[PDB]
Design a protein around this ligand. Structure first.
Ligand SMILES: CCCC[C@H](O)CO
Length: 230
């Protein structure tokens, strides 16, 4: 069915991302925790469309630092760790369903599943180094942290909360842990090239593609925005 093929309209981050997308080698589907967008139905739509378009499909779920997003919004570690385990199991279940429905390998990982992967660790070390040493990069990472906390303050119905620096620096551990997949997901996973796919623009990615940092995306890595249109 070709409503499936056209389920999404793709907006590439750069012309290189467009080339990688058109090669259709691999898509990495980013599933954000504690985000109402990722219902069972939407996860199925992502995977159905991906399965029709791409040679290889992988799903990326949140790793351990997802608890930091709750701990920063006033959640004690015990409750936060529980909510994470439950959210990740929900994402895995729905993703496994749709992959199996499409005859696809159950290729699902969290961003914590790569502590023994040299590419993930070296990119992560680069991210942490420039977070410490480049105030401009640090500022952009903290803005990603602010975005993550602000959207879940609305979602979890806590819109009255001041977002403090201590909140930002706690939640930015999540940002730093996920960033290696934005920068080098294809090489971490072992595909020739890949696009990470998400439904919102990546502002820091725009700056990276404008050559504003010593942090760079790998030449075989792209980013695409998935939009749905009538
Ligand atoms: C699993 C982390 C989610 C990644 C998405 O691109 C949103 O950050």
């Amino acid at each position: 069915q070709q409503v499936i093929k056209d389920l999404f309209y793709v907006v590439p981050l750069s012309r290189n991302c467009e080339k990688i997308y058109k090669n259709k080698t691999h898509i990495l589907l980013g599933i954000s925790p504690f985000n109402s967008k990722f219902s069972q139905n939407y996860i199925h739509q992502l995977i159905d469309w991906s399965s029709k378009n791409f040679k290889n499909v992988t799903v990326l779920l949140a790793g351990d630092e997802a608890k930091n997003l709750l701990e920063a919004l006033g959640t004690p570690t015990t409750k936060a760790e529980r909510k994470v385990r439950k959210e990740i199991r929900r994402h895995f279940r729905f993703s496994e369903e749709a992959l199996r429905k499409n005859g696809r390998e159950i290729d699902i990982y969290t961003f914590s599943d790569f502590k023994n992967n040299k590419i993930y660790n070296e990119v992560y070390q680069n991210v942490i180094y420039y977070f410490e040493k480049d105030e401009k990069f640090r500022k952009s990472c903290l803005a990603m942290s602010h975005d993550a906390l602000s959207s879940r303050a609305k979602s979890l119905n806590m819109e009255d909360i001041e977002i403090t620096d201590n909140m930002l620096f706690h939640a930015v551990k999540y940002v730093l842990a996920e960033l290696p997949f934005f920068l080098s997901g294809a090489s971490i996973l072992g595909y020739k090239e890949s696009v990470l796919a998400y439904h919102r623009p990546w502002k820091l990615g725009e700056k990276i593609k404008n050559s504003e940092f010593y942090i760079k995306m790998s030449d075989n890595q792209g980013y695409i925005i998935l939009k749905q249109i009538n």
